[PDB]
Amino acid sequence: AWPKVQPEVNIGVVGHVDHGKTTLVQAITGIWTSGMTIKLGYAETNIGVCESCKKPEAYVTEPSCKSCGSDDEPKFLRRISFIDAPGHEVLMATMLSGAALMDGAILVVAANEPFPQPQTREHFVALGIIGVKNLIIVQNKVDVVSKEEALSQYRQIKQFTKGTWAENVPIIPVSALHKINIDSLIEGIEEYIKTPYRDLSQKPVMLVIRSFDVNKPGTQFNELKGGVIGGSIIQGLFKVDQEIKVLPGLRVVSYEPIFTKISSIRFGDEEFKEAKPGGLVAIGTYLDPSLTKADNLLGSIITLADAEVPVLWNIRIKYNLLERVVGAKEMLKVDPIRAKETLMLSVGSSTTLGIVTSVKKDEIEVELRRPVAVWSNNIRTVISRQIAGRWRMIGWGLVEI
């Protein structure tokens, strides 16, 4: 007897590359994010428990208990969604992007590999630095290792998850490929990744990670659907028919706000009348599909029209740096930040470039190539530097206003 409701929580799925992030997500939802991941993947699932029987196994994905023991229709707890991040060292930029929609995450370490892999460390300290603390570790490719190997590693993961903020960060081996043990993971995520409270009084603010022209080639101007802007709500809640604006909006140099009305609200295959935090919405707008196609409005933010939002070109940042540059094979020490340096400031789901203009103990001023739309005074920011051809995360901070 289940209901059709939009996702309650967003759970990122990070990890070194090819350790099987998308597969695990496909083992929990049946859906897969269309080879290697390049753009953030997305999937939804209803999560229910079997009142009448034994857990892990008691955690149902569909309204059915006649799967292990018996019959009363299991009870609905929530509909969760995942943010399937890429893992290739080059796409780091886009995971941080996704990290800003994460309410909790699932680091995925490959059993059949030397645990501390470059991206395994990066995604790990990346979460800690950001705030995504509700973590669950998942040893995954067990189906192809020694019963001692996969246990020697568990040791290391256990070792690693020590000094850090990963106190009891569960480690659950699974076999995303054979969907083995996924039951306990649901037991896990249904315990450690608890849906957060959402004050809907706050000013509606959505982070955009996608936008596209829905119109199939050949659609007559007659039935042209307006552009769709895909994102994730961080606070408050939007509803169809609202006057909204996209920031920094379209560019001219400057960036003047793109205004529109919420034509539609959709989550997964079903259409709703309102959207709130958790889950990934597709805001249907009445604007020319051109403005929002490939993914033009990625990194923007949507807020109701006539909202007080600073769109800065220059931004002050109270920061901190990592002692080493976990991410390159070589753990090279992070060099001080030098003025006139070009850095990659990742803010919200947006990623931007800017040349450091000022540098003090824990505060730097960046002149961005593109403005950022600052909706709060805490906007977490992560800083990457182009260490060696590839962009590496060397620190983080807070944007001040």
Partner: protein, 259 residues
Amino acid sequence: MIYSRSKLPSEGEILIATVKQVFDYGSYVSLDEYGGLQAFLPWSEVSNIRDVLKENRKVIVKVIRVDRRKGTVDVSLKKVTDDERRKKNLQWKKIQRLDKILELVSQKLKLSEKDAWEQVAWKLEAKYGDPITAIEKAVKEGEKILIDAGVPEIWVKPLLEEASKHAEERKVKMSGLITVRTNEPLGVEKIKEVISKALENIEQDYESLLNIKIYTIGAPRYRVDVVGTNPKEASEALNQIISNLIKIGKEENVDISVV
């Protein structure tokens, strides 16, 4: 030819007429839907007039007065409403499809159009409906639709066949690629306006033709299709359109151009 089942047109009626002669103190038009019954269009009733009041243009007009006694008629193109000018215009292409068919079916059956309009079209008229739509069903369904109407069975087949493979070897396609951008909050409506404003009443001016489509092929790149009977009315219609777009657009906050 479109023989009518009446001598004169009902007063206050609308109908496609064609300008046959322009004189000083007036102009004789010709009522198509009535064997080309000559009516009179007096200046006091008219209103670039150079293109409406043309040598052979086909404009739609109201039937001012009808003198059943002298059997003469006067019409006006001013009294015709903007509503009556669109609705009673779609009737044209339909009544213009029925025409070409019969003029061909008969030409083939070494018969006459009047014979083609009294047995076919006139009878399909009883079976409620533009005889052209009752034929619409025939080709798809079966020649059982006509026979039930009482359409002498000399036409039935000659019709069906001649109806299908007609537009084919009578069809030509012209198209252009344009770019349409907007920043308007409802710019998708403005595009659904500027297009359906520029692509308006075109079925009369650049005249007749067969079909027009405007679609999205890319994001801002759209295409326009003008498939008609006369190859040489290609751009004629396509150019006016592509221009109408630019004009209305370059004036409706919608940026439009050709590739």
